[PDB]
Design a protein around this ligand. Sequence first.
Ligand SMILES: NC(=O)c1ccc[n+]([C@@H]2O[C@H](COP(=O)([O-])OP(=O)(O)OC[C@H]3O[C@@H](n4cnc5c(N)ncnc54)[C@H](O)[C@@H]3O)[C@@H](O)[C@H]2O)c1
Ligand SMILES: NC(=O)c1ccc[n+]([C@@H]2O[C@H](COP(=O)([O-])OP(=O)(O)OC[C@H]3O[C@@H](n4cnc5c(N)ncnc54)[C@H](O)[C@@H]3O)[C@@H](O)[C@H]2O)c1
Ligand SMILES: [Cl-]
Ligand SMILES: [Cl-]
Ligand SMILES: [Mg+2]
Lengths: 485, 486
Amino acid sequence: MSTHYIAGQWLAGQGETLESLDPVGQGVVWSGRGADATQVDAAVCAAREAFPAWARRPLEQRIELLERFAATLKSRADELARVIGEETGKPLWESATEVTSMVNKVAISVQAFRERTGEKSGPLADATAVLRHKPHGVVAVFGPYNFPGHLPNGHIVPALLAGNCVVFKPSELTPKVAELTLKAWIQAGLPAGVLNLVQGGRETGVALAAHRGLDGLFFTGSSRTGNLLHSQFGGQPQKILALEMGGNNPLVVEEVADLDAAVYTIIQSAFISAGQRCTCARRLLVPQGAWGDALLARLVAVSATLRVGRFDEQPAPFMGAVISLSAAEHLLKAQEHLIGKGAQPLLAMTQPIDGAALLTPGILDVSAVAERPDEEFFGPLLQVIRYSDFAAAIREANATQYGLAAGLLSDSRERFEQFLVESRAGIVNWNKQLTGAASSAPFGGIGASGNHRPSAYYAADYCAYPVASLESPSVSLPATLTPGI
Amino acid sequence: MMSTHYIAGQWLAGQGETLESLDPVGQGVVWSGRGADATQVDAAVCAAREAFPAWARRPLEQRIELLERFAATLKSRADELARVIGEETGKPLWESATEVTSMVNKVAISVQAFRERTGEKSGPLADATAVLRHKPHGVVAVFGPYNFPGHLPNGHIVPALLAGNCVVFKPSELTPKVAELTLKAWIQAGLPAGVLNLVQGGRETGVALAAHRGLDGLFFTGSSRTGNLLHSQFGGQPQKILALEMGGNNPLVVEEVADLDAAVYTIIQSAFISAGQRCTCARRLLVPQGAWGDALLARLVAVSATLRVGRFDEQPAPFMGAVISLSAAEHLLKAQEHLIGKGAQPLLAMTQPIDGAALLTPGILDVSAVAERPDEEFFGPLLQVIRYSDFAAAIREANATQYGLAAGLLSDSRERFEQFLVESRAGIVNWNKQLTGAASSAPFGGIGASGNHRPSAYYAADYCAYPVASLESPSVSLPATLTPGI
Ligand SMILES: NC(=O)c1ccc[n+]([C@@H]2O[C@H](COP(=O)([O-])OP(=O)(O)OC[C@H]3O[C@@H](n4cnc5c(N)ncnc54)[C@H](O)[C@@H]3O)[C@@H](O)[C@H]2O)c1
Ligand SMILES: NC(=O)c1ccc[n+]([C@@H]2O[C@H](COP(=O)([O-])OP(=O)(O)OC[C@H]3O[C@@H](n4cnc5c(N)ncnc54)[C@H](O)[C@@H]3O)[C@@H](O)[C@H]2O)c1
Ligand SMILES: [Cl-]
Ligand SMILES: [Cl-]
Ligand SMILES: [Mg+2]
């Protein structure tokens, strides 16, 4: 019954029933009716009504509320980790780190706001030049399922900080996490209408994206969906759109002295979250020859031993299920399809429990595949390409329309310096796993992975617009008038 | 002799349609050439592409030295450049000289903005070093306007080259001579072949360039109509960065103030400087109902009728010159006629005193009684007046527009300005200062239909480079504690 949160109260949905299912055992974890078009309009109108007072209040009051939210999350951390685990399959240790990221987002967002969208004042001739930044108004946040708390939070926190009001539409796959996140905001004192939650599937998302009352839409999800949204907004520059989309991220591994360290780094890059982070390594470039062979064989051996299991299983698993049976089925077909085109399974991905979305890591050598898809496979399926020399590695790493992350494992600083020069990505690491980018830095992909509105530290930039003012306490005549007067 | 396109370090004659620019008063040919056809546009994009890796590789300090030599070259040729701006746009020499000074000054401010907004930071994070760098996109097109034919394109070109992009510049077909001389200065400054390319032309050329798949970015200043078409064209192509600086319908609210003379002067500078062709010019003057407001307007009309309007090099110097073409003048006069037809009252009718010349005298029209007032930008010296009942009505009317570039308040009350800031919806919001002449040291971007949330001037840096976040360690290593399950 308490499905949507609009204008400061909960209400039942009137649209299609939505259920989220435990990815392993398939039990219903949450259900409710989606928001119909009417309820979506109510959510936008609620944000609209709340906006003037929220925008008008002192910044420090908005900061206090965001700080109370982080403190409330912290106090409910175990409960939220458990819900994230229940719904996404993520092991408890990993879900806990997601909650920690949500808590930490507040202080970092405050720092970024003062730096990127703060207030400055200075003399300019006879007058005073002031710079301020102001919120857009009502913004929709579309959440993904992979970090169902942290990634929407990475839009919601800086948006509310700047003085916008938000309508949050979570992934239909992770509604329970969103519900609990709203409960933390509510417990923290958030004013009615400042943040509104509309749950639902396609129809709800479509109605919100189409709503003319939005001043902005902040999105994390697939490049397919984000491109649709971008096309939809073509010719409407008045509405700010921030698109954080997927990638096809290469990890280049030169022969390095500490081979086990490299193998561990590859696993953390490719298979953490069962390969469901935006930044996971999708293609592993490994040089031809004996060392490369040893690297791969060790990777395959260690990856085969990785614990895959239930979120709350003990001993704790390294990774959990993919988000649904549908997603697992789709990945197994991608593996089958590639193998059909000549890919060699160095370690074949399997589904060890019938009717559960658990998948074991996959490592496929696609060196011999003629035409390789420039496609993002959102799961633990790592493609390997063997390369002849470093220039060919760089060429291959760049052979994608995407541009989120890239990385080099190499003992050579000179080699990394070249890699930086030739890379085409928002995140470029040296000897560190591709995953776990810190909120203290901007996070945005280029090419098909974004629309030049990087999030994380730079989220501030799309949450407020600059207002430049020249101010003087009275009109006055200049000492010398312009000619002709 | 003519100099038409500059591509890969060489001057080339055009293969497209003939293009002439005409002195807006005398109608004499100021510049003439053939536009760049599609194959020449492709050559220019390819030239930028070929030059990009080396230019982007270069140490920042070497790009800075070129930009500084360029500024110094503009300074040495300042008189020459002011007279060409005057010739082509009609703008008085005194005002043209200020445009050249803004061009020179853009370099040092862009370097400051680059280090602030798109610089490099490095520090420890866990057992690694977190480094932030910014990289250029690649090849960017710059579409120039006619109103500031040197300063506004320079405001995209300088920060774009500084960040390491290479550029294809398509100037307004109304101001090609200004762009030619600007390129001659870049060339004299030592610009490397292909780093900045110039394709002159009309719509044929602009359409070919905007469509070219080789662009990584397109930076535009011009009308909302044209910018919206570009935005539509790029829908579904988020990989190409678009920065759109469009026009506005800017309101200036005037409360009763003690210094009536200063108020009138400030309004004139806001509405009629550059013959009303700055994108920040006041388009709507909001004046309180009642005797004081009637007096303000009576004075404004009397003073506006005496403003000197004339040729760019006339002496005594005119306050303002012609609008950009006879066609533009025609369009503005028709707009005035249409509005009066619908009930607007001519407090001061705009006139075209010399047949065959695009000189227009200032217009002030009371549109209060006009039913459905167009939310339209009239790019010329035609000021619309709306009389309001109370301050809340003034704010409502100020905000009754799809645009959002500039807004201002003349008022002796700081409290009224504070409220005005709270309720304003514009990127430039001034108190007791003319709406025109914004600082390069601050961001310059309109909201609503006036931009796409990519402000230029100080924040141009933001769209000229993308951040690259790096975590770095001299070698791979194992954590003291492995993740579970391994
Ligand atoms: N660059 C980044 O920051 C980043 C970060 C994390 C994840 N991702 C990504 O997220 C992905 C998968 O997660 P996902 O499945 O939730 O992405 P998604 O595209 O499926 O969905 C994200 C969201 O947009 C919506 N949506 C779905 N269909 C819609 C439609 N037809 N019309 C309008 N809205 C619609 C949702 O319901 C929702 O809240 C990737 O492809 C991936 O790499 C990107
Ligand atoms: N926000 C800003 O900073 C700002 C500042 C000053 C002026 N302006 C503005 O500039 C305007 C007028 O100048 P303008 O006449 O050059 O505007 P414009 O749209 O006609 O021209 C600007 C440019 O884009 C091009 N172009 C024109 N038609 C095109 C087409 N059909 N397809 C592709 N490209 C095309 C040009 O040829 C050119 O270089 C305004 O409406 C105005 O307020 C904006
Ligand atoms: Cl080295
Ligand atoms: Cl991450
Ligand atoms: Mg309670």
